[PDB]
Write a protein that binds this ligand. Structure first.
Ligand SMILES: COc1ccc(NC(=O)N2CCN(c3nc(N)nc4c3cnn4C)[C@@H](C)C2)c(C)c1
Length: 354
């Protein structure tokens, strides 16, 4: 499989970075390795996350990043590709010698690239995870796609961003990154502000449309991911694993600890202050969206449970501790309860989150 030799050498770099002790040391090896890998490009190799036929021409080593984590060495790359009509039939491009928002990232790399002038030039971006098992993430991705359209169909304006997972092996794979987004940890570290103060500074003040729309996005995304976290039993929830985007949505990531596999969905005081406090209109709206999404989820529960059963049946997954996993999942929809008892459930759920 020469067409995968790009993939195998990428996963090798990842395993090597897991040997190095510090981010600084991982960065310098990543650069060194990618620089070496450009000597083997351009080639008849793909990056499987893309939706179109292409050949990988170049990997700019200066723009690759080692990401934070406890154990492993996850790293982000920006892969340059020339698009083609067909993968197998179109000739591999000749090698042309050498000498933040997405549009700027694209512009700056394109201007610096020897391939950037060409009409078929495209830039793709992927996070490479080696060591970790992304079947957990991939199940979550599918449940997210399903829930998104359950809320689309019943007119409920909850908001979640499913991101594409690609399982290469049992202990490796690829995640497509969220582009306009940084961790809540990083926002707080860089700004030295509360989340409310960050909103007020970055978007605008309490009565501006910029704020109110960003606050609306924040509320809708929290309520969305709160239900996701309850239904899927998502653990490992911290400001490292929650992103904030340029529009003011939150994005939960890293659904590796779900179902039968402390650390639950915490609604912090600083989160509640972004919604104008407990005795407030947008917090009442947050509680409404949780109730509205849950009734929409109850009616369409077969469409989710289908997706769960299809991904466990051909695995020996750690989250699947036998048929208790679907049994407990089903019970979390609470079909026997009334809508009045579901209000009390939502209220008890929010109290538990605080
Ligand atoms: C406690 O000290 C920590 C500090 C920060 C982080 N976290 C982190 O830096 N990021 C930024 C890069 N990351 C992603 N960025 C973007 N843009 N899209 C993504 C991901 C992950 N999935 N997706 C879709 C994730 C690694 C989250 C941590 C764990 C601990």
């Amino acid at each position: 499989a020469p067409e995968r030799e790009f993939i195998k050498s990428l996963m090798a770099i990842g395993k090597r970075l897991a040997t190095l002790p510090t981010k600084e040391q991982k960065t310098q090896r990543l650069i060194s390795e990618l620089s070496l890998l450009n000597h083997k490009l351009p080639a008849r190799v793909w990056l499987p996350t893309a939706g179109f036929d292409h050949h990988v021409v170049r990997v700019p080593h200066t723009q690759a990043v080692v990401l934070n984590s406890k154990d492993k060495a996850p790293y982000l790359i920006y892969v340059e590709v020339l698009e083609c009509e067909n993968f197998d039939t179109t000739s591999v491009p000749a090698r042309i010698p050498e000498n933040e928002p997405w549009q700027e990232k694209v512009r700056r790399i394109r201007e610096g690239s020897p391939y950037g002038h060409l009409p078929n030039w495209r830039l793709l971006s992927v996070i490479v995870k080696c060591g970790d098992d992304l079947r957990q993430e991939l199940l979550a991705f599918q449940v997210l796609k399903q829930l998104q359209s359950i809320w689309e169909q019943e007119r409920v304006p909850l908001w979640i961003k499913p991101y594409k997972i690609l399982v290469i092996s049992a202990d490796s794979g690829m995640i497509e990154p969220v582009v306009n987004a940084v961790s809540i940890h990083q926002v707080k570290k860089q700004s030295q502000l509360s989340l409310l103060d960050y909103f007020l500074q970055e978007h605008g003040s309490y009565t501006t449309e910029a704020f109110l729309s960003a606050q609306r996005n924040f509320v809708q995304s929290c309520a969305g991911y709160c239900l996701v976290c309850y239904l899927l039993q998502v653990k490992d929830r911290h400001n490292g694993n929650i992103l904030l985007d340029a529009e003011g949505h939150i994005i939960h990531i890293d659904f590796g600890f779900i179902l039968s596999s402390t650390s639950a969905f915490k609604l912090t005081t600083e989160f509640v202050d972004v919604m104008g406090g407990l005795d407030g209109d947008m917090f009442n709206y947050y509680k409404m969206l949780m109730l509205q999404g849950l009734i929409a989820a109850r009616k369409h529960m077969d469409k989710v449970v289908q997706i769960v059963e299809i991904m466990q049946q051909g695995s020996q997954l750690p989250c699947f501790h036998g048929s208790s996993t679907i049994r407990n999942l089903k019970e979390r929809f609470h079909m026997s309860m009334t809508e009045e008892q579901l209000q009390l459930l939502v209220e008890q759920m929010v109290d538990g989150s605080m």
